[PDB]
Every structure is written in C-alpha cells, then in structure tokens.
C-alpha cells in the first residue's frame, strides 16, 4: 500500500532496492528529499525492516538523525519496530542514541516498553542515558517495573539505571512494581537499592501502595 507522496519513500518501504538504487543514482537529491510526514526514504526503510536499503542510503552519507514532524529519528523507528540489524547499522554511523521525539521518549523507551532486549543492549552499549525522562518524567525502568519485564530490568540495572527516580505523579519503578503486583520485579528492585521511603503525591510510600503478601515483605526483606 502507498504510505508516501514521494516515490523513493514508497520504493524504500516496499523493499524495491534495485529501483531505489537506479532512481537515487539518477538523482542523488532524492535520498534526502522529504514527504508529507517530513520522512526521507531512510525513515520508511527503518519502519519496514529493509536493512539492505538502509545500508545503501548510509553508504551515500544520508544524515542519520533527521526527525520526521512527529519528532522520530530513524533510530526511534528502528528501535520501536524491532529492527535489530538496522539499529546496529544506525549506531555504526553515529546515530544520536539520546534523541527525543515530540512525546519526550528516547529510542531506549520504545526498546524497554516493547521488550527489544537485544536493541536495548545495543542502545545502552552505545551510550544511551538509562535515566532519560519522558514528558511525564517516566524512565525505561518505570515501564519495565510496571509491565513486569524481569529480563529488561536486569539489562537496565547492569547499565547503572536508577531505581529511585519519581515520575510527574511522584511514583518510582518500585511504586509501579508494587501497584501492578509484580512479584519478583519489586523484590529484585529493593535487593538492588529501591527505596521504601519516597512519597508519590498521595503521601504514599511503595509500602502503602503494595498490595497483599508483599508490602511488609519489602520491609522483612530490608530488615531480615
């Protein structure tokens, strides 16, 4: 289906490398020309998962950090869409790991919330701030703790992510872990230093928020 009013963006999105090759070779201006969504062929190649097209456009020296009018860089799209190899090629040409889009999210945020384990690692080995804050002051860790992604939490802890940052509602990963009753997640979090003292904007500690057989477990865990 047609996703763009610019031909090169449609060839890019659909996998039509050879046609794209011949087109841009004819006019090298097409590789950086933008469409209705301010996207180049690089953006649409990132979206569709056409690694070989990405590599061709990168060889050409297309800028690799240009944001579509939603704020999304190629690295945002690749990370969200789960294109392991494309993310690799993007970090290979110095793609800005910490770029942010209109909503305030970095690529890692999309990696963490969609469980792109290999891509998260690649962003983090690549210098992504693990404590990057969205527009609600929420972190990759908030997402992982809230969604119960144990694998992702281990990844984030290893890369020195904080566990004691407050979102605009004043909750820390541990608050959320507790609130959605994430069993191991909250245990693993207080074992690696998640505080039982910080107050969300309801005077509530993570202890208070905790439900059932937990809550005081995170106090018999910290006084054992």
What SS3 string covers 137-204? Answer: CCCHHHHHHHHCCHHHHHHHHHCCCCCCCCCCCCCCHHHHHHHCCCHHHHHHHHHCCCCCCCCCCCCC
Task: Give the residue from 22, 19, 23, 27 showing the smallest Cα distance to 50.
Answer: 19
From CA 127, how far away is CA 107, in angstroms rounded? 12
Resolution (A): 2.2
The sign of the dihedral angle between the CA atoms of 100, 104, 107, 108 is: positive
Structure tokens at 136: 């609600």
Task: Give the residue from 10, 20, 9, 77 showing the smallest Cα distance to 49.
Answer: 77
Q: Give the determination technique.
A: X-ray
Structure tokens at 116: 């792109």
Is residue 112 within 8 Å of residue 121, measured between CB atoms? no
Is residue 9 within 8 Å of residue 41, measured between CB atoms? yes
Task: Give the residue from 189, 91, 18, 130 showing the smallest Cα distance to 206.
Answer: 189
Structure tokens at 52: 């070989």
Burial class (CB in 10 A: 0-12, 13-18, 19+), 71: middle
Is residue 150 within 8 Å of residue 184, measured between CB atoms? yes
From CA 32, how far away is CA 41, in angstroms rounded? 8
Is residue 167 within 8 Å of residue 142, measured between CB atoms? yes
Structure tokens at 9: 């963006």
Structure tokens at 200: 């969300």
Measured in degrees and rounded to the nearest 5, phi and psi for residue 51 equal -50, -55
């Amino acid at each position: 289906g047609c996703v763009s009013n610019l031909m090169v963006c449609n060839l890019a999105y659909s996998g039509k490398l050879e046609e794209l090759k011949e087109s841009i070779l004819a006019d090298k201006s097409l590789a950086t020309r933008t469409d209705q969504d301010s996207r180049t062929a690089l953006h649409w190649a990132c979206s569709a998962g056409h690694t070989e097209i990405v590599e061709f456009l990168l060889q050409l020296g297309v800028p690799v950090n240009d944001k579509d009018d939603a704020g999304w860089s190629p690295l945002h799209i690749a990370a969200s869409a789960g294109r392991d190899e494309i993310v690799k090629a993007l970090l290979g040409k110095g793609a800005q790991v910490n770029a942010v889009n209109q909503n305030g999210c970095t690529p890692l945020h999309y990696a963490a919330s969609k469980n792109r384990h290999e891509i998260a690692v690649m962003l983090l080995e690549g210098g992504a701030n693990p404590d990057a804050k969205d527009h609600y002051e929420a972190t990759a860790m908030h997402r992982a703790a809230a969604k119960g992604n144990l694998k992702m939490i281990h990844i984030l802890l290893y890369y020195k992510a904080s566990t004691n940052i407050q979102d605009t509602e004043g909750n820390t990963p541990l608050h959320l872990a507790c609130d959605e009753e994430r069993v191991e997640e909250a245990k693993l979090l207080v074992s690696q230093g998640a505080s039982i003292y910080i107050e969300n904007k309801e005077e509530k500690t993570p202890l208070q928020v905790a439900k059932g057989g937990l809550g005081l477990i995170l106090k018999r865990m910290v006084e054992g």
